[PDB]
Amino acid sequence: MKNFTTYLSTAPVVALIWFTFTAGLLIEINRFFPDPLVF
């Protein structure tokens, strides 16, 4: 499990997880609050 979590901590896996989180957050914000142009 230690070796597996080290693999999950390699740069592309962390990049995949973080960018999936960020893209999903942006997508769900735009789903819940459609068409934001201004604050």
Added chain:
Amino acid sequence: MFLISWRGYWQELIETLAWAHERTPLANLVRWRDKPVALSIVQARLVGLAHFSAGYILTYAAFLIASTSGKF
């Protein structure tokens, strides 16, 4: 072509061509004075840039003058 392909490809190609001329009957009666070689690295950058720029300018000049003068 001058900007993407670089020198050593052309030098080996020219070597085969120089072999061909020396071995071809009725043509090897004539010889070069200057040994044919590929253009230098810097010369290639220059010549590619010159063709790129001249084509850029000629294309836009034709488009500009034709598009404006065909209407006006």
Added chain:
Amino acid sequence: GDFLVHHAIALGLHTTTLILVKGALDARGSKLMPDKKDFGYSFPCDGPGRGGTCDISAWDAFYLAVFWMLNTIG
């Protein structure tokens, strides 16, 4: 539209200037080639050693910047 294209023009001016200025200031030497002044303004490269050194001369910075100038004036 004038706003957007003027900022494109600013990008072109600043990038062409960056290439030209970096070429002029690194013309005498850089970390990759600390004795570049000994080789002159225009030379092909310093060979594939030290990672490879294509287009390291200041002349090559001019050559790269002409593309950006043509893009900018375009």
Added chain:
Amino acid sequence: QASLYTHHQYIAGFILCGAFAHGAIFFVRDYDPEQNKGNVLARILDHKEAVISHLSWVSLFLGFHTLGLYVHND
């Protein structure tokens, strides 16, 4: 009018490239560091990394945001 504007702007672009080219040539061939010790020329050579890096930053900012606004509008 269109031909004259385009003609003189392309001529201006080529000339500006040449200006910076001959500045680089000056730095290689003619610049004497001992004769310019501590003056404005030597001092701008002495912070060339700051100048180049700031030109890089402004070019990157302009490119990222101008292209991004255009692509968003597209």
Added chain:
Amino acid sequence: SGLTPCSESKGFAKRQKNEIKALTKRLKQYEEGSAPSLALKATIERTEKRFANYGNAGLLCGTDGLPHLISDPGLALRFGHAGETLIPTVGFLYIAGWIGTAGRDYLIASKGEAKPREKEYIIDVPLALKISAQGAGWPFRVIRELQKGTLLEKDSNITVSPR
């Protein structure tokens, strides 16, 4: 700039009416209650809400009938356009300083390890999450580093090429 509010712009209203009309023209080829009909009606509802919201935000409209943003901080604050660029500027700068400070903190913390390069491509994920949480208080720490003199490395410790 000679603009008009979008809520009183005729071009803005014409654009809303034309977009709704195109979507409604697409609608009259499907039965009611079908998935295409529901999807098109949802798009129509979103279009109407979007035009109403852009009118109600006080956005200015050009002769194109489209919203134009005001970005001078003076004109924005006095005429109620701070939500267009100024407040987004503050929000972006806060998040960007957060990201940069978290990255700097992680790099500095990794510099003291026995194998500093290992943490750069095999991420210390608990440490990264802890540092990422602490990036919320970045302006205070960064301003203190600026006044103290520890934000910047001294020029005598940085490599430079021969001049």
Added chain:
Amino acid sequence: KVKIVVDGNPVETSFERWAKPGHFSRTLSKGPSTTTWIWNLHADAHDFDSHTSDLEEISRKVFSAHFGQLGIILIWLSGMYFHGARFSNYEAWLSDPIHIKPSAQVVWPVVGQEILNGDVGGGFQGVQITSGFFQLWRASGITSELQLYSTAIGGLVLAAAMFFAGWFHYHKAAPKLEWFQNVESMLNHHLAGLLGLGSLAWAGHQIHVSLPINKLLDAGVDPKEIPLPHEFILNRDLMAQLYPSFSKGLAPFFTINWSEYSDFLTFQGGLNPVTGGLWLSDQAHHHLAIAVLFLVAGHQYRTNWGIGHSIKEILEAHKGPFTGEGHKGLYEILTTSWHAQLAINLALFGSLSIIVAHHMYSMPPYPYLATDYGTQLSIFTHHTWIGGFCIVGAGAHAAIFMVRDYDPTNNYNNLLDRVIRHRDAIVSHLNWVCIFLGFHSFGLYIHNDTMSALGRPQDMFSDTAIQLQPVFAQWIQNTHLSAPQFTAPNALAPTSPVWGGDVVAVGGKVAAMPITLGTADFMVHHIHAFTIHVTVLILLKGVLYARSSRLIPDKANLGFRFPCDGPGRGGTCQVSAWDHVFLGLFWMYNSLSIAIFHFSWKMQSDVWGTVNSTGVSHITGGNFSQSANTINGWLRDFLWAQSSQVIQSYGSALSAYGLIFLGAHFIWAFSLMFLFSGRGYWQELIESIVWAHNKLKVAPSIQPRALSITQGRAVGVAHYLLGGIATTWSFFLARIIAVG
């Protein structure tokens, strides 16, 4: 003696090496000092012979990697069947394949992207597909989403089996080297067992499932009222209703009364007029005959029962007075070099994909494929591109063999040795051929453009001026048109309508028609010959001079992939065989772009279109023969005129193509920064940027480097190809979806 030999449990199954990037390589396992290590890890990941010199370990890695690729392909295929089952208008299209556009992708409503769910018909909204799956599923007899679901589930089970096998044959039971070197056994099994039994089993499916269901479909029966395939399996009388010879059962087969089966094993030729596709009974007979031929072919090679051929003996016997020792030593090469095998197989596989493109457009094998113009254009273009890339790869791995696996001791005066010993003659003659072809192909167009601009159309190379008729191809067309009369008497019709004869029309649209050839066709075919010969010149020159040249006599010591041997000898950039692959990719792109442009314009101008009482109204109205003999004709009447659909696509469901058109133009232009520049500039720029990071104490420990010279070239050509090909992709698809 051919036998199964494995090693038990050679490699432990553990995540320990997953946690150590670059473990496979002795240089890379120590970890990075610079960012170059990050790229080198990916570049060297599948270079097995660089990791070790043991042929057994390399072969085991290759076998298990092939299982992994098969599992990925099965996941992809099951995905396509699943999206047909779940996210498609397939059943509605089955009820009305002439008016309903196939769609099997639906986008979610967010950020306005639901406009891409176009009104494709059948009460359905989605992205229109051009892969041809609907026509393939209909030809197979699939009538419901349940059968598509079943294939998707079965594919995922088989995908898991492939991934299990790759793990199993690497970690548990890894075959030894002598198992892999049983090329006689592998050829016998792949000819008779894979291809032969595959064709026999597919003939079985066609006869028992595809033939009766499609017969009922083309009769006009509603697909929901057609009996399921197993009803045709279990009820022989039901099948005998459609094919009366089935009442006799298998007795005509066993008594050699094969002509009784003539109702479902036919030799009609041509196309089914209802669907515009090839007759499925013809396909059943074709696959049966193919199966028998391959089953016979798989008994040629000696394995364990004395009879059969030794391939080494065959090769060593074929030598002549011109060729020295002939094919001696080739058996040792092809049983010890994986790269030599890859070179051969890539060359033939790519040539096969290109042949497939031509044969499927000319003889459309699926119902309602030929009038789905988007699908026709897409599959031609796709298989052409796959073929070209595979051929360039053949050149690459031939060169890799020459650098790494060639041994002069085992090649003394054989064919390979003698080819190397006159490489200058080969390359110089091919150089002359390329120059001659370029002059007498492209210069004809330049002559025509200049004559037309000067107001001298009578001085042009054209059908109404100085003519260049392709008389040999015209004679071939006439011969193939006249074939059912004399030279193929039991075939009712020619193989394709392209040779001559009448228009095949489906739903008021042309499925296939004669493709006449005039001066413009002559000119563009010699363009094709020129571009193919130049691409051959680059790749073959890379192979022949991979080890040495007059310029660099010790090039093999520098390896397959190296940037140069320095600025000396005038300058030696791109001497490596890898760089010949790099240049050959561009010329492959140029060649295949002209080929697919030729296809698109000629089909739109001379084949595709609507049928009226008067005749055929083609999409671009026959303008190929009028203007394809000038470059300006191509630029205006093809590129400028046909790009109207992609640049007007905004605000429609085709707007994704307009965006991809622009983005692909961008990616293409972006590539020129990598191709035109050099890493010395970029490394110095990075020095200044690194100074800025050092000042703020944000310099990384993994020291940033510019890309290597070779990586700069690889990035440049990858983005060039991606941008150009995706530009043509969006142009083609928007054009033919909107006007098809």
Added chain:
Amino acid sequence: QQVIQPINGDPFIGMLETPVTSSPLVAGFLSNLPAYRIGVSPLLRGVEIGLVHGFLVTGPFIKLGPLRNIPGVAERAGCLSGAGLVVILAVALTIYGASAFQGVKTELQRDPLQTADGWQKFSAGWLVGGLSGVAWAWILTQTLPYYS
């Protein structure tokens, strides 16, 4: 039996002897061409070569030139064009000789052609033979029975 051998038995001169190079028909035919008559004067070999080449070039000019569709004018224009090409090639041959010239065994004397004076006589012979061959081509278009 092997029909490809090193050039003159020397494996290290960059040439191979093949049936194309060294068949008795090919080597006999090439030896009797005027280019390979080493002892014959370069002027007369130039005359023969010029006759052959000036005659042959008129054909494309006659049948494919801009005036090819004008009866009578087509032949005269094609022959004047061929004469212009012959004169241009004479200039090229002459400037080749002035620049190119500033042992051989089977012992052989070197060609008098491969000298400055010999090449200049060759150029004169080329010019005379080429103009004569162009004129003879015109005469043939005016006199051949089945010419069209």
Added chain:
Amino acid sequence: LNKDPLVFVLGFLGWTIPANIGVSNSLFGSFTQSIGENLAQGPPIQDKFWLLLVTYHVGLFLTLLLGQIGVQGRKQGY
């Protein structure tokens, strides 16, 4: 050429005599009839003379090539 040339009716007649066998006339007979009919202006592109020419000549050339190889290959060792 070092071709070892030998007088070859075995191949001149090794293809022509089998090609003069009547099947549903013969290839050689049809070829000669086409030559005679075309000798009475070049043959058109619809004429069977081209196909008869190509088939007969590829058969004769392959027969001659295989005959030369068989005579020389057996003599020099197979």
